[model samples]
Target: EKFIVGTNATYPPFEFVDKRGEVVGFDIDLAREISNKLGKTLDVREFSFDALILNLKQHRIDAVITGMSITPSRLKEILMIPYYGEEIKHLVLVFKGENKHPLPLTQYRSVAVQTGTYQEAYLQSLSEVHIRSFDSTLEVLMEVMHGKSPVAVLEPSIAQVVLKDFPALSTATIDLPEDQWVLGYGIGVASDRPALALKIEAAVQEIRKEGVLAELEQKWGLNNLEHHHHHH
Candidate 1:
């Protein structure tokens, strides 16, 4: 049998090409283990987070390995397999090399969010705050880094990766901790593929035992739970 996996490669730690230019990350490692266990070789292909769905619908790929949030609406379109766990974060950016002062959210006037996902849900819940939603979180990072908006509502791990590349940005919470995101996969296969889905689901746990995924997380410090451990 063949095991061709689709991944939203733009994400880091979870799945990304490392500095050495070789594909490496948690998802890539886990996929390898799953295929090894199944007596198959894993073939990985990269796609945008949004396009991964369309690719699956067209049978262009099999299974999604990005940080896809398993939500109610997506389930109506595809199968959500909870492999890993979940976590989320909130963040904003401020100018660099200037006398920085506290910028209140209410005073910011607007923020950026990724469209058609929990980001929208997070923003909608903040009805009192104005949010400018984008199709990709990358756009949110660009907009925030360029200081286009007063602030940005984004996933912390993602924002952290961006900030690492661009040091001008900083993040913190107003009063609440920004560690409430869920982690899972969106299997864009037929609804009748439940048995196969369960098989893959079991692999989610099996891969963990081999430490394959852990090595990748260690490769990029995904183990660091920001605003999580008090030791800081």
Candidate 2:
């Protein structure tokens, strides 16, 4: 069997392009392993994060293994198999250069967020703040780097990767508790493919049992950040 997997390769560590210009990341590695376990040829395709859902609905892809957050609305559309055991909070970041001046939530007048992301919705809810939404996470960070916005809301791991090249950027957990901004990333299959979902779940179970997931997290420095629950 052949499996066409879709991903938004913008999220670093989870999914991103490598120096060889290949689609690579933690999620990609796990997808390959799942395909191997199923004895299928895996073909990974990239698309904008928001477009992934449409691609699945149109039957252009069999499944999505991107760093997609599991939400109630998404669960209503597709079957989400928790690839990770627990939820993690989104990272709130500011340029390291701006650290001397405290920029609290109310202090920042402008904020940037990736379009179709949970962060975008959350940021837009803030009062007396200017919200800018873009299609790419890097672009949102760029806005903050160039001083377009005081802060950018995104994943913490993404901050670590982006800030490596742009040391001026740094991250801190939001003043609010992690739960207010927490969400779980998972693999999504079409609702009609119940059997396929079960197969993916079985593969996830094996990986968790064998410590492959933990090993990958350590390899990618995911352990350095927030604490997460490992689902058995």
Candidate 3:
């Protein structure tokens, strides 16, 4: 049997398609390890970020690991196994030499965010700014660089990864109400497949205990961020 996994290959450092057309990154490595433990060959399929959940429900994919955050709404549709603790700290990026201070949302006429993301939802909730939703992080970053939008809002890790490629941009933390932050990164599975979820959870626990999770974190330069710890 093959371990079928789904991801959106645009969020770098977590999951992204490399130049060779291979889907590879920290989450991919973690998925491979989980597959190894489950004694199944890994099969990764790419999809738009918003479409991942529906595909999971249809049994088109077994799991999703695309730096996906666990939210209250998602919990109703899927079993979320928290692997990494991710505190939502939205970072606003602007062209270099621009003010790094947290700018009021009302100051900007529009802001850029990737479609179907927590960032997009947050921006949509606000009243003043025009929200421009794009397909990928790179596209949102482009909007900022080109001055099409005053800034782009991104998750902390994604902002760091994409910024490396765009030296012209700099970031500052933007504070949202406590309710806006998501808890952590989750491996999403269909709610009906509880047995599969249990098996995957066991594999995830084994990796965490065996130090493989830490090794991957170090390799992926994720050691500095706050990681969520799971209790039994």
Candidate 4:
């Protein structure tokens, strides 16, 4: 009767707790729409980003829509259905002074990323750099702001939205090789719930067909991304 969705309401423009204390964002809206299409009431709940998978596996949530990227390892743990077609971009944030030149990973003694995120895994792949993993993107940004870490890696759109309030922070883009680029964001569902996953996939297609996904993207200021095709 109810579609219980779990999200880490910390990533802006995707999932975040608004001033009104409601879980609201592009993902929330999309999940609500999907629930409607499925003829189920939507119940959006907050959880740590890292905890989402376990919750799904335990049947605590019907699906997860927390800007989660689809990956091979994740696919093994749960079923992921692509809702957004645009691939993610890695954006680096640093204090304005360090922003003078293009700083390479080796130049920074320490870097921060959110725990259990694809960005954290990406950072771990590098050598000779200290990777600090935090529970939230804001904490990652705070590490850089306070000089605890010279750099922080975050999703491009989330970085842009959060950076607006941090005047001292500036950004640089990472040039990842094509092979390193991961797939776009998706909704995560338990592996056993193939029926629910199929319904979600079909509902997403309908949402795309009705142009609601595009309108939601536009509403969230993600219209600049090249979403028409999978590869950009």
Candidate 5:
């Protein structure tokens, strides 16, 4: 058997549905290319962000490549193959009268965030701060987007998506004063799939050298995107 790739389809530009009702996005193309490089056929499986990990554990897929983050803890759960690098975008959705640029974290009252995120943890650490957690960043933004909640902390690139319709809501940049969190997706394989993992690692390195990431991110409207080579 080749490899079954697990991915979540909600994140736009990176991964999302096209108007034609077909899946098409930067991540989708990149995954296909990576599989081709490895001489493997990709079996794309649609999954939820949280469910991606579960599916992997259940052997539903052999790999994950849907704009995911690789933390030290996650690295212990599964081997990570590094590829694209994106900066941590800190911003908030607010009423139209609020400021338009980022400031230190202390400036906001209670910031909203999606659960199981570095942002949620960052906010929870502050004894004087209150943080509200949602299932996804978009849901958190909906709180501020609809004026039900005035503030939600998240990547600015993601915030711009829901911001399209809310004229009454504005945005302010937040350069996190505390420990800032940054994350990116890479190839993840079972421990037994080391050979496949190394193959993906090579493919990721080649893509980095060829500047494929920059081209893809630019094409996708990734805001303030940063590129780095984790391989030495």
Candidate 6:
């Protein structure tokens, strides 16, 4: 038997396509381990962030083991297991040191964010500042690279991972206070699939205790991101 999993392959280190053109990342590795523990073949499907939840509710996928945050509203409809403990904070990528004197939001012609993320919502709330939303994190950063936006807002860890590959763009710290700064990522299943959620939860704990989780963190540069997170 095979278990199906859905993920948004846009957030690097968490979930993204590699040079081999295969979906590979931190979440994918964790999902593979959990599937093996459960004695099921795994089928991983990719979707946009917003469509992931819809796919789950429609039973198109058995679970969503992506960089999905556990929001209060999501908790009401989806059962999720916390696989990672770090809090996701939205940060920016601009020319290095440009953040020393942060520009007014209105001064920037546009701000790019991954659609269906907290960053997108936050940017939209600003009203006057134009917000450009893309399906993938890479696309959003490309927008900034092409001068579509002066700043690109994304999770700190993801921004760091992407910037490492696209060195032309450097990260900027969150100079302005953001009310919706942090959230925790989890593996979400339909509310009806309590058994599936429980199994995945156990697997998550097993990996963490067995040190596989920590090993992945180190392999993917999560350790650096965590340190950068605290310093900024």
Structural RMSD, model 1: 10.1
lDDT of 3 by residue, 1-232 (tens): 9999999987667877788999998999999999999999999999988899999999999999888877766777799888886567555655545574556776776888888666677777787877888987779888887888877788786776667888788777787675566777889999999999999999999999999998998998766432221110
Window of ten residues with lowest summed lDDT in model 3: 223-232
User: What is the TM-score (0 to 1) of candidate 1?
Assistant: 0.54
Candidate 6, 1-232: lDDT as tens digits: 9889998787766878989989998888888989988889999998877788889989999899876766656777899787765465545645423555556666676777777655566667675888877888778877877776777777665665667777677666664354454446788899888998888888888889999988998888764332221101
Residue lDDT tens for model 4, 70-134: 76567778998998754554545556565666556767777888876556666677777678888
Task: For residue 212, give model 6's deviation from the true position in Å.
Answer: 0.7
**Runs in model 4 lying further than 4 Å from the true structure:** 87-124, 128-181, 224-232
Question: How close to the true structure is residue 191 of candidate 5, measured as C-alpha lDDT?
Answer: 71
Predicted candidate 1 versus true structure: per-residue lDDT over 1-232, tens digit per residue: 7787888665555666778976776667777877887677788888766677788767667677665665555666777666553444344443334424544555566777777555556556554778777877678768777777767665555565666776776665533233333333444454656676777777766766777656656765755522221110
Candidate 6 stretches with Cα past 4 Å from truth are 87-182, 226-232
lDDT of 3 at 221: 77
Weakest lDDT window of 10 consecutive positions for candidate 1: 223-232
Reference-based lDDT, residue 14, model 4: 82
The models' CA-based lDDT, in order, is 0.61, 0.73, 0.80, 0.78, 0.67, 0.73
Tell me the lDDT of model 6 at 64.
91
Q: How does residue 152 of candidate 5 score in lDDT?
A: 73
Clashing pairs in 4: none
Which wins on lDDT, candidate 4 or candidate 5?
A: 4
Task: Estimate, for each residue in 68-123, the C-alpha lDDT of model 5 and write its tens digit.
Answer: 66555577688878666544545454444656543444666667787765556666
Cα-based lDDT at residue 190, candidate 1 = 43
lDDT of 3: 0.80
Each candidate structure's count of clashing pairs = 3, 1, 1, 0, 2, 0
Q: Which pairs of residues collide in model 3?
A: 85-228
Clashing pairs in 1: 86-183, 87-181, 88-181
